[PDB]
């Protein structure tokens, strides 16, 4: 209802505040400079990011009239009705004082008049064009529109006069998300032992509109937790129940339960690799002031390679969780399509989603399958592989801004990748993940059995992978359920990776050095 | 007659139904039969005019108003039952349906006998055989 309810959209809020207040507070200033401002805004971004809230806040803090129009609401199957609705809406808005019209989901009523087939939609597009810009176009009225995909709009609509400026309201950052969270929780009574900073860091990938839903769910959970034994005021209200209210950390954690939980603890061994990864991932975000004073960008790419089931994806998840960034894990074959131009579309969509929410860790598993050597294949599958490889090359390092994205590749055949993905600036770091040693087996046994009721079984592995140890542990747990963890389970479980792979991996590691 | 409830003067269909029910009530516990109710009782989806709503609502309220001493019953006969205003199907307005379906072989023989009992039939007539080949014939 006011500007104090706005969090994270500092620059955009200030911009819109200026554009709407300057010509209303001091028109004489614009007369002195002798021009008029632009009366048009196009908000674009994900849904649930304070668009409507910001519009109504601007309308309320500046005495005006706010008229809401829904996209599908005004659309009519019958002929001659939609444009009449638009005309009457604009007319009644013009009848009031200086007003702010808001068109929500305008892309549903602007199909560009290019690929559209029906006739009503193009007629309503023409009606909008006439209403916004024409003879006697507008007299002291502001128009705002909101959309998710702004490219699916008629180019005639994105012109000066109609929609002069195009503000971008994306996902808020950590500080903006903290502002939003405190804004929502200010009305709520907060019990002690709750810290907003941690709850803002943990809710890394939340758009902002569902933060309010999170708070409401936490309050609902607390009140439901203190109503099973306390009466529901079916006879009379009490005074000892009103006091001692407020949400705690458990309620908010439960609400968050209603993108993986790793805290650098389950990972065992690989100490130097862990140190290098945290070093090269944390400084770009933890302490960027040092980089910007040194005036140099951070390294982004990393590539693991070795035998399978070693913990590559687990390591990626752990590093993603240590930082408050997001995490997009995709498999190689999972993106290919039998159609023409679909795999590259998938790659572009994934990287656009990654760049739209920074910082972000993108994890490409089985990179050999997707980034195969272009070389020579003389086939349609060869053409598709070449096209997808080129799309990767141009999307990882091309005509982009590369604001903050950390690409991490995990492969099993390091020889089947072209010498252009491994170029520094794309996947500069190449770090071989080896098998675990005796001390590494001690570490993995200690970290696997944290919430559960060892050297002898650690020395009885002789070159196994972490997946085998996980299988042993799960079998022991299953037998414990069937029957604390007894020694007989481990004794009977001990009874239940090719050397060639080892040779190949070592060959590539030594040749690389 | 269903489509015969409208009139020429402004707002006379309601008066027509009112006087029809008044005449049906004042004389005796009579029985009134409305033919082709679908013609004056379509689902709201297929209604755009305003006189249709007025006459439908008048018929609804006339149907609901039923004193204990009235002892009058309405007979509806529609061949298009899936396009009726469901408001009439509520309890107290029209609760008892009569699915007059297609007769069987015996029914067809009965109909044949009923219709042929007023004409000079040759001796060779065997209606039983005819009542087995007229598979889909109805009434």
């Amino acid at each position: 209802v006011g500007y104090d309810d706005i969090g994270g959209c500092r620059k955009q809020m200030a911009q819109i505040r200026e554009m709407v207040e300057l010509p209303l507070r001091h028109p004489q200033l614009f007369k002195a400079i002798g021009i008029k401002p632009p009366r048009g805004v196009l908000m674009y971004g994900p849904p649930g990011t304070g668009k409507t809230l910001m519009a109504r806040a601007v309308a309320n803090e500046t005495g005006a009239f706010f008229f809401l129009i829904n996209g599908p609401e005004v659309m009519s199957k019958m002929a001659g009705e939609s444009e009449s609705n638009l005309r009457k809406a604009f007319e009644e808005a013009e009848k009031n004082a200086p007003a702010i019209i808001f068109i929500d989901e305008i892309d549903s009523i602007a199909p560009k008049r290019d690929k559209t087939n029906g006739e009503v939609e193009r007629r309503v597009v023409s009606q909008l064009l006439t209403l916004m810009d024409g003879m006697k176009a507008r007299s002291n009225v502001v128009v705002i529109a909101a959309t998710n995909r702004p490219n699916s709009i008629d180019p005639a609509l994105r012109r000066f006069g109609r929609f002069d400026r195009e503000v971008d309201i994306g996902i808020p950052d950590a500080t903006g998300r903290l502002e939003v969270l405190r804004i929502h929780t200010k009305n709520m009574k907060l019990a002690d032992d709750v810290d907003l900073e941690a709850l803002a860091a943990e809710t890394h990938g939340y758009v902002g509109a569902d933060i309010a839903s999170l708070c409401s769910e936490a309050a609902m959970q607390q009140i439901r937790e203190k109503m099973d034994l306390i009466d529901l005021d079916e006879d009379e209200i009490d005074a000892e129940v009103l006091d001692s209210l407020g949400v705690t950390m458990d309620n908010f954690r439960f609400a968050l339960g209603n993108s993986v939980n790793v805290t650098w603890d389950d990972v065992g061994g690989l100490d130097e690799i862990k140190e290098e990864l945290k070093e090269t991932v944390e400084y770009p975000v933890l302490h960027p002031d040092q980089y910007t004073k040194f005036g140099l960008s951070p390294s982004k790419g990393v590539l693991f390679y070795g035998p399978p089931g070693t913990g590559k994806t687990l390591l990626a998840k752990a590093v993603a969780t240590e930082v408050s960034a997001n995490f997009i894990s995709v498999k190689g074959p999972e993106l290919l399509s039998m159609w023409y131009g679909e795999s590259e579309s998938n790659i572009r969509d994934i990287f656009d989603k990654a760049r739209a929410a920074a910082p972000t860790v993108v994890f490409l598993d089985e990179l050999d399958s997707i980034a195969k050597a272009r070389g020579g294949s003389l086939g349609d599958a060869g053409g598709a592989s070449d096209r997808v490889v080129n799309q990767l090359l141009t999307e990882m390092d091309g005509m982009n801004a590369k604001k903050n994205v950390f690409v991490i590749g995990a492969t099993n055949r390091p020889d089947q990748i072209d010498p252009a993905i491994l170029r520094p600036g794309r996947l500069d770091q190449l770090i071989y993940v080896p098998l675990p040693d005796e001390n590494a087996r001690l570490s993995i046994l200690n970290a696997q059995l944290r919430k559960t009721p060892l050297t002898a079984i650690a020395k009885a592995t002789q070159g196994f992978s972490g997946a085998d140890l996980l299988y042993i542990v799960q079998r022991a747990a299953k037998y414990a359920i069937k029957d604390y963890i007894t020694k007989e389970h481990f004794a009977e479980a001990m009874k239940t990776v090719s050397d060639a792979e080892l040779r190949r991996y070592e060959a590539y590691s030594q040749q690389m050095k | 007659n269903g489509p015969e409830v409208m009139s020429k003067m402004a707002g006379e269909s309601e008066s027509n139904l009112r006087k029809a029910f008044e005449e049906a009530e004042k004389n005796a516990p009579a029985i009134i039969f409305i033919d082709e109710i679908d013609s004056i009782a379509p689902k709201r989806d297929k209604t755009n005019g305003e006189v249709e709503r007025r006459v439908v609502s008048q018929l609804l309220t006339l149907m609901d108003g039923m004193k204990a001493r009235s002892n009058v019953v309405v007979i509806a006969a529609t061949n298009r039952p899936n396009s009726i205003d469901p408001a009439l199907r509520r309890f107290g307005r029209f609760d008892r349906e009569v699915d007059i379906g297609i007769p069987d072989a015996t029914g067809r023989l009965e109909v044949l006998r009923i219709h042929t009992k007023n004409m000079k039939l040759a001796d060779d007539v065997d209606l039983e055989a005819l009542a087995a080949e007229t598979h889909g014939y109805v009434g």
Binding site: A79, S337, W339, E342, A384 | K8, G11, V51
Partner: peptide, 22 residues
């Protein structure tokens, strides 16, 4: 006296598209 009025606006059609499989 009352009066009636006719109205016939439009309908909805279905198109068919072609694709190119790689």
């Amino acid at each position: 006296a009352a009066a009636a009025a006719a109205a016939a606006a439009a309908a909805a059609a279905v198109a068919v598209a072609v694709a190119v499989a790689a």
